Amino acid sequence: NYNGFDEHTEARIQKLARTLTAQSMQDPKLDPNSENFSSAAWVKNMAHLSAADPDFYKPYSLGCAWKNLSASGASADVAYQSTVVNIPYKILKSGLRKFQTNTFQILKPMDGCLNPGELLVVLGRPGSGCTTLLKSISSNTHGFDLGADTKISYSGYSGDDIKKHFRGEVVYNAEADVHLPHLTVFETLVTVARLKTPQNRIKGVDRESYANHLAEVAMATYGLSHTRNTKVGNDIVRGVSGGERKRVSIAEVSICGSKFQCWDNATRGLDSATALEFIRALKTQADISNTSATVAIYQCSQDAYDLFNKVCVLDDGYQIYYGPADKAKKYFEDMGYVCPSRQTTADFLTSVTSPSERTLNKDMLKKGIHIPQTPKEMNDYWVKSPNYKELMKEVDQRLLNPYTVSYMMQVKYLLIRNMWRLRNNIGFTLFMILGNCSMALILGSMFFKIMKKGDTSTFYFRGSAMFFAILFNAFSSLLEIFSLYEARPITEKHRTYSLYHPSADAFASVLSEIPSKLIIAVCFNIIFYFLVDFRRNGGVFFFYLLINIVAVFSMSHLFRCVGSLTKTLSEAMVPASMLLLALSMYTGFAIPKKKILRWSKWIWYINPLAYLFESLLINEFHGIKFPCAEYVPRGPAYANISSTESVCTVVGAVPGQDYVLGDDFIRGTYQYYHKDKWRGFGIGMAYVVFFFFVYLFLCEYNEGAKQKGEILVFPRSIVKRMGLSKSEAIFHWRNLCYEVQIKAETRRILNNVDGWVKPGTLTALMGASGAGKTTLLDCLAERVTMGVITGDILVNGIPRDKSFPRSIGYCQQQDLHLKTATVRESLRFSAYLRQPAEVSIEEKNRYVEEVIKILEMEKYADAVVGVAGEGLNVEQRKRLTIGVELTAKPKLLVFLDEPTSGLDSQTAWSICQLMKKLANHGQAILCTIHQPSAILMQEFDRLLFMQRGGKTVYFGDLGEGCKTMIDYFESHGAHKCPADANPAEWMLEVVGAAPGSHANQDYYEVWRNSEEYRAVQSELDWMERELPHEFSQSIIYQTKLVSIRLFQQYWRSPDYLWSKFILTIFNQLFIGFTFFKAGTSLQGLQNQMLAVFMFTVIFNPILQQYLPSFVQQRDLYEARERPSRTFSWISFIFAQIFVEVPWNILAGTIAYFIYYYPIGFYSNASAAGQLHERGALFWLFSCAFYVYVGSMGLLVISFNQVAESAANLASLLFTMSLSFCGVMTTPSAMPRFWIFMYRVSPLTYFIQALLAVGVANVDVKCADYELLEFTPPSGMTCGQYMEPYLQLAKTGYLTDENATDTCSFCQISTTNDYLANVNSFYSERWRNYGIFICYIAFNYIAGVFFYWLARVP
Ligand SMILES: Nc1ncnc2c1ncn2[C@@H]1O[C@H](COP(=O)(O)OP(=O)(O)OP(=O)(O)O)[C@@H](O)[C@H]1O
């Protein structure tokens, strides 16, 4: 626990000061070693030492005064939900409404003043304008605008002053949880203390020693010195606790030296003890550094409220009170509202703004004196108050009278921090290194057997191997965008502190990835270059290595720029995919620079990979003569030949040559000239530098954070215009015990628990964290999977059946609903699937309307659930949860887990009122309650109080004012309950884990031996004597409803569908028009092969775009719908399949139309008289490919938990399939080992069939440079000369069969002969289609099976 600078921390800070000064030496009030030390002065000295630099004019302390502070913002309309059809018009409308609005008064004029060293607390129900006030007084006024009369002064400096010259002294923190998960607390603080060492003025101690001491004192002051070596952690990363993480925020801003602070959601997710610790850390900072700190908080504890100097109270943007915290209660008591004895003053002030919870004074209503009731009247009363006169007499008097370290040091310290991140999360780094190296080994091994010979038969494979080398080197670095997005929030926070240039963070993040890039570019390249057997000269190898290093750095900087412009990785996967396709496909291998069309030659000219690949090919081919592999006149009749009467079958060949010069081959095929060897390096370095600087400039400026109104979405159709079933049976349990085996061998978590719930009764379940409240609720609701349960649960004395889970409603604490569904649609979905099938749908609709009316939500009964930020809010989301569990007509009970937790006192009271209403309608509610107020506690009928380990201490009716419980506890030697004490806190103090957690005795024993225990046992015996289809709907009906809901999710998911379709359109149109009418020359056929190959590379983006949808539906299902027995996993998976399939078919049809015809396959079909059949088969293959991408996404996401891991696995499998497809290396040249991968990969059959359907059954038309030129023997024309050869090699043709001087010879006479080399046959098209369909079926079946394995209990 943290007690706010208590003597412990004074001693520990003296220890730290002794350490520092002894190290350095290697007035007595400030001397660590001599007696009479004062740690408070010591730390305070440091505050001066960093603030009072004679060269930095930062103020010692900033107050704040503000009068007439009005804040207004653009009115909040109802934004109709975006669907996949209406979003284009929405976009156009938004564009016209942004180029060519009425306002809402967020905050009515306010006054106030916060002096240095004071704590201000802002109270008010959500929506009252607390966040806007904090942003206004801290000058973070973006998304709204202040009035012309607003006068705000920071002890002389205007808002326009701190906004420029002192920004970072005035800080607003919407959250105190944003941190870097993998840095330890000490690392997180020492990096900041290094960036904030006034190092030009400290003498006698190394800058690092002083930074260490400063971070150590910051941990000591704020109670974190135990977490020195613990990872700061996160929600998903275990580490320090939430309270300790918020105190790390406090210590970090303390080191940063801010003077005016605002904490908006300070104690979100914190129980009273931890929230009080946080407020105590703020108080410690206030009196150690003189920092005025404002906070907005909910359910402020009285012990936490006492710490606050001043209170501001808001109501609908009106200021009802501003003054000392200890006078607010009395001020509102004079106004005419009476505080119930057991109400904390924070709760009293916040409830005075709640028409249904205020207790107006009757005495002043006897004499008929006016009491303001509406917020306008309360403000009109305050402005007339005498307290307002005092406050203004102070505010008037108050108004009438960049970085500590250089840029290089900032870069150095942030680089050290980045390395700390790397070695604290090394696993990802090792994954990158080893995955790249192993892909190197595999893919290079694929090239092992063919490069040994070194003949001219290896030229295409040399091209393709160099293509692989450059692509892999270029795109290896792309995993660091994850770290970029992970660090952006922290960079923004540290920017709002005048802590460092964001350019410094960008530059340091670039530098921290160099070691990984070099390790990869060494290991991968050594393995690949050795195995692929490129030129063995050391010089050429090192030139290759340098080119690859330049490639990786250029692409890393380009995609850092691309990621910088985007907000989330999902928003970047589309443009990044477009750039990836362009760069990869115009690199010079998929389409030689000769073959590129006039419309897209500029792409090749601006592609750094193009020049780098040119340099690589020049390096690999230049100057080495390759012996010939086969000459075109061949066989028996062609043994006696003169040199000039036979060529090599390769582009650069010359008749009579024993070899081909690689230079000629590249000049002819690619048009690369040795004079361009070093141009590629120069241009690559130019782009490296330019995009590095663009990345810095983008990270420096293009950032922002804007405010937004709480907007309901209300689907467009709406926007155009705009009883209960009694719980029937008693439920009870007896001698219930529970055990697990995970954290220990037979670790008990519920121990001899017993009790009951009856119709029309509200029973609270209480106990400190742990104590198995949620565990007991899960055990009773038959909701647990692990552990074993003994003791008997019963309904009317009979064991609970196997249909029991459908008779109980269980409202989970962390409610989760389909974010696209509306409230009414969600309720009706719940009713349609859970209520009995014999009930008509009209009756279910009527009941849903009745439930909507009961819970008071017809004002938002057609609102979209949305997210926590937009759509519904916490209160309305909890109301929807309760309604969803109610609309299933639970026969027996409604279990509620912590329905109030996380809310403010007024909405928690509204929830408790709803629960009491339901218990009055006839329901039987057993709700778990966490740290309730006395007013909330009063509403409950019965109480079941447990100790840690689920040891029941008191079961019974608590009675009025909790008097029965108080009497039971007092009558057994408990210390009495003070008349102002909350009874729940009192009983957790009597026995529990509350601060002061010592119990004079163990009260489980007292219960066991009590009178009430025997009363409970007698009643439970009498109930035992009183006793005298796993789903509600058929699997088909469940699948119908679930698939309908998923279709309504895809529709209304415009981002997913439109990213899918525009990615398909761009990628496929770009492939089609890059190879626009590629023709039927020998290079044309190869270009069409590589085009059909590029068609597949849309695999990964489509799968990754898809996976989040399944993950969302899966989270909803597993969390809520599975335990509720709403529908079976069969229905869930079949919906995930049926919905995905049609959209993928549509995408495949679009791709077919924009790919088949532009590339020219249709003319190839027509010339063969096979137009319609080949077109239909090509369209079938396109649709099958997209359906296959969907099915493989399902297969990988079925058993994987996170989407990213499933995407990585799918990418690995697709890489294997594509690499061994037989296109980058023919199976003949493949090593004997890898043929299995060439047989099992679906893309072999897909691409073989698709290229056969594209180019087969037409005549080859060799281009001028492709034709072989030689001369015939004496006296015979080339027809006679070549006739014997054509007799055997039944393919090839002569341009002039009768020519006698020199003849041009094309190897292949028909595209079928070329395809046979690729092993693609037009006779196997339908067989290959069948094989691909079987692949799709296997994917879906295996995905269903793996979901049943890894996920279904
Ligand atoms: N442009 C705008 N900016 C901010 N709020 C706006 C705007 N337009 C309307 N509002 C509304 O004004 C009210 C101001 O409340 P504000 O969000 O400032 O405090 P709060 O919501 O009580 O605090 P918290 O965000 O901590 O819950 C909100 O209900 C919001 O929906």
Ligand SMILES: Nc1ncnc2c1ncn2[C@@H]1O[C@H](COP(=O)(O)OP(=O)(O)O)[C@@H](O)[C@H]1O
């Ligand atoms: N991984 C686990 N395996 C087995 N039991 C667990 C595990 N995690 C938590 N528990 C048990 O479940 C309890 C958490 O739920 P519970 O305590 O009922 O919620 P609350 O703390 O709100 O009452 C813990 O006290 C612990 O005894």
